[PDB]
Design a protein around this ligand. Structure first.
Ligand code: F24
Length: 387
């Protein structure tokens, strides 16, 4: 049968701060071969932000790129998935709801589970719309991935947000009901209260990440009978581009030469933008989706897209979407390329200073920044934004 209600991603966009540092410049400052960052790790430009830009700034900018008048009237749920919260009680989603001018009778909250938070939001939104097909949900991934100067994870760093509008009859990606979820209690990466930077066991994280994909994939294959041949492309959450390729490589070892090339070529398309941005944590998978859709030229209506989401801790999920005819007319390629091209290239000195600076919310202060939705002042610990 056809004619059934479809539910999924109607519009999607990302935002990153107007600054970056080139990995060659970093490599040289770190006394390391630039090839080690550019190729070994697989990153080219690291998105960096000043203290006048937080998850609200990025979420607001990303969402503003896709929301229209009618969307703002139909949205009754606003969700932010993040692991970079600025408050322990008040959800960042509440401020986003105001800044976006969304209609008042909506619920807003924050979801936390490492880089999986936005995925939890996406699937829950899907179910919400299934029961309420006239309504829409704003789901935004927002994060600031900082490991530390001279840390192993430094070259993988990034910052920004990915906003998605979930609705019935979505114009881009129709989501399936083939979800396979997994939870394991593992301390590969975490951030205890009071830690500005994360605790991380790189080895354990990479091992758990790779095995988590294998595990949900095998279960999915067992439930559905679908194999890699049945997927036109796969989008992955990734800690960094090379590790993503390694998780994929590990699982397609038994595929024919031609299918490996096809699948790997798709992966390369999915990491175009990540190479110029770095890790968005919760937004990494969905940046990969945008990148795939905007850089691929042979993808078409009806194609099946597999999505692997991961959260340290650890949680994982594999689910499927189908490209909706006409989707190529509802992307934001021009805007994204302009967004990436109009950034300032920071010197190592400028980078390390911006990175080190900290916002002390206990001190009332004023902050100057041209970016819309940036922090304009702190008063009694309360952040004011431009609007
Ligand atoms: C998301 O779930 C999670 C953040 O919570 C993220 O995907 C992974 C975080 C940890 C990833 C590390 C493996 C990054 C890193 C330290 C790698 C390198 C290059 C360092 C090294 O010492 O080799």
């Amino acid at each position: 049968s056809t004619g059934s209600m479809t539910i999924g991603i109607d519009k999607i966009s990302f935002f990153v701060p107007p600054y970056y540092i080139d990995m060659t410049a970093l490599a040289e400052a770190r006394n390391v071969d630039p090839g080690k960052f550019h190729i070994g790790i697989g990153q080219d430009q690291m998105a960096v932000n000043p203290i006048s830009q937080d998850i609200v700034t990025f979420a607001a900018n990303a969402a503003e790129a896709i929301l229209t008048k009618e969307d703002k009237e139909a949205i009754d749920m606003v969700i932010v998935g993040t692991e970079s919260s600025i408050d322990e009680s008040k959800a960042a989603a509440v401020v986003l709801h105001r800044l976006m001018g969304i209609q008042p009778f909506a619920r807003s909250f924050e979801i936390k589970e490492a880089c999986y938070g936005a995925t939890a939001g996406l699937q829950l939104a899907k179910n919400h719309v299934a029961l309420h097909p006239d309504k829409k949900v704003l789901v935004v991934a927002a994060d600031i991935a900082k490991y530390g100067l001279n840390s192993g994870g430094e070259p993988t760093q990034g910052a920004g947000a990915v906003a998605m509008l979930v609705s019935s009859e979505p114009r881009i990606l129709a989501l399936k009901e083939d979800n396979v979820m997994l939870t394991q209690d593992i301390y590969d990466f975490w951030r205890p209260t009071g830690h500005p930077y994360p605790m991380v066991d790189g080895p354990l994280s990479n091992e758990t990440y790779i095995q988590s994909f294998a595990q949900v994939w095998d279960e999915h294959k067992k439930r559905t009978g679908l194999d890699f041949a049945d997927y036109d492309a796969l989008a992955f959450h990734i800690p960094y581009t090379k590790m993503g390729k390694k998780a994929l490589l590990a699982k397609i070892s038994d595929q024919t030469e031609a299918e490996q090339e096809r699948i790997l070529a798709r992966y390369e398309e999915s990491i175009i933008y990540s190479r110029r941005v770095g890790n968005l944590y919760t937004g990494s998978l969905y940046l990969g989706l945008i990148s795939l859709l905007e850089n691929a030229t042979t993808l078409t209506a009806g194609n099946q897209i597999g999505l692997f989401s991961y959260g340290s801790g650890a949680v994982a999920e594999f689910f499927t979407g189908e490209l909706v005819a006409g989707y190529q007319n509802h992307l934001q390629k021009e805007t994204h390329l302009a967004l990436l091209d109009n950034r300032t290239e920071l010197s190592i000195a400028e980078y390390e200073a911006m990175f080190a600076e900290t916002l002390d919310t206990d001190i009332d202060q004023t902050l100057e920044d041209e970016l819309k939705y940036s922090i304009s002042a702190i008063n009694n610990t309360v952040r004011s934004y431009r609007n």
